[PDB]
C-alpha cells in the first residue's frame, strides 16, 4: 500500500484489488486488477465501441523514461512539465505517432514508460495501440481502438505496475513479461555478418559487391547481406536495376562463396512510380476512397500496403516464398510503420491487427530457419515474429556532435538507443544496434569514436554487423572487430538508466572475458574498460 497507490484510477474508479464490470454508452469492459512479483497486473476483456479507453490514471512525475513505437525514434529521459510540441514534418507524419492528434498538443510515450523506482508497460500490442499522455499534471494510459466496433468480446491488452529502488530490474522484468505473453524468438545463436549500405548506400555496384564478396573470405562473417541499392522501384523487389544480375543469381553467387544470402526490402511500401502500384492501385490504404501517402523518401510519395486484404497477404506468401526458394535466409525487412498508418482498409480491423497479419504472412512463407530483421517498425506488435530488430535510428560515418535528436542518421544518437533499449535484448528478441563502421579511410570517425560503439555494442551482447569497403579495413579495424566479439555472451545491465546528461555505466556478467565495465560519455567521445 502507499498514499501514492491510493491516489491512482483504473478504468474511472479508484484503484483496489477486485474483479470488475464496467457498462457504459457504447461499451463493456471486464477486468481484473490482481497482485503479481513487485506490483500490480490489469486485464480483462472488451466489447462494443471502445474508441480510445482510458485504463489508468495517476500523478505525473518530473523526470520520465519515454519511448517511440518504432525502431528509428527516441528512448530517452524527459523533463515533463517543460514540454513543447514539436513541428511534424508532414513527409514521416507517422514514424513521430500513429496518433499525432496526442503529440501535437501533450508528451507521448508509446507502450511503456518509466521514473526512478517505477515502470509502468503493457504487455502486448495485438488489437490496440497502448500509449501514455501527460495531461494537466496527471499521466494517463490509453488503448486506443481506431473507431473499430466489436459485436463479441475480444482481450485486453494487459497492463502492469512495477515498484523497485532497482529500476534497471523492473525494467528487464517487465521485458520478461512481454516475452512470456508474446511467445518470443530468442535464437541460442547469434549472426555476425556484412551489410553494404552504411559505404556504398543507393550506388552500390555489382562490381563492387564482387569484390567485398571475395574480401569477406578473410573477416569472420557467417551472412552477406544486400541492402537498398539492387531493386527496380519501391514494390518491385523481383527486378533488379543497374548492373546487377537477377536476384536468384545473387542468392545463388553469395550461397557458393560460402555465405548466408541476405536481402533488404521494405515489404509494406509500394511508391506511386513502381509497377506493383500502377497494376494494383486499389491494394493501397486510402483517404476519401483516394490513395494515402504513408511517407515520402526516395523523393516520391509512397503508398501502404492494405494487410486486410487477401490479395495482398497471397502476395506478400509469393513474394517471400519465392525469395527463400532462391536461398535467402536473411531477410531486412524495413520501414514496417507503413503498414499501420491510419486510415481506410476493406476490412474494418485496426490498423495493429492488419500489421500483425501482415507480419504473420512474412514469417510463414520464409519458414522458421529463416532469420527475420526487423527495421522502422512498430515494436510491441512484432515479439514473436522477428527473431532480431534494429532499436536506434540509423548510425553513420561520423559522430553528429552537432546533429538534433530527431531521428536524423548520427553514431550517437543509434549509440544512446541501443543503451536505453538495453532491457529488450534477449526477452522481446535479439537487438540490433546498427552495423559497425571500422574502415580507416572514407569516413570522419575517429579511432577512439570506432572503439566507443564497437565495445559498447560488444558488452551490451547485441548483433554484430560491419558495414564496410573492405579494401579500406586494415590493422586497427580487424583488432577492434576481434575484441569486440571477445566482449559478446553476458547478461548486461545500464546502471544508471534515468541519467539525463549522455553518461551511462554498464556492466555485462559472464562474457567471453568474464564480467566487465565501461563508463562511456557520449558527448565528449571517451570510455574506459574494465576487463
Ligand atoms: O533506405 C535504406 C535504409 C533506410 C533506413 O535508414 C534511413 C531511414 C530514413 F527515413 C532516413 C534516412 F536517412 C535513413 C535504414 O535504417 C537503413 O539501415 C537503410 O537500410
Ligand atoms: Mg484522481
Ligand atoms: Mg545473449
Redesign the pocket.
Known sequence: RGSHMASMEIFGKTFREGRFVLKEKNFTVEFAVEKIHLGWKISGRVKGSPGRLEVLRTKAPEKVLVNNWQ??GPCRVVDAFSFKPPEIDPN?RY?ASVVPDVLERNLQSDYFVAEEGKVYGFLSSKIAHPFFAVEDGELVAYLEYFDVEFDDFVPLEPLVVLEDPNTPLLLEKYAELVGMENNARVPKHTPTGWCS?YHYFLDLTWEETLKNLKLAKNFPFEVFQI??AYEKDIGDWLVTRGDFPSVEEMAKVIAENGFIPGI?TAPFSVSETSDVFNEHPDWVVKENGEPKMAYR?WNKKIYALDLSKDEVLNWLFDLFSSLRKMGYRYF?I?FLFAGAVPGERKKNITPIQAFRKGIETIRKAVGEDSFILG??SPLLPAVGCVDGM?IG??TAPFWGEHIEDN???AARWALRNAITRYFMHDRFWLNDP?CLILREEKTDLTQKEKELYSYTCGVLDNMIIESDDLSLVRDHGKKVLKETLELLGGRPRVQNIMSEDLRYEIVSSGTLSGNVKIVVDLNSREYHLEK
Open positions: 525502431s528509428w514521416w514514424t549500405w541492402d537498398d533488404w523518401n531486412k524495413d527495421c522502422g534494429r535510428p540509423a531521428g536524423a542518421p546498427d
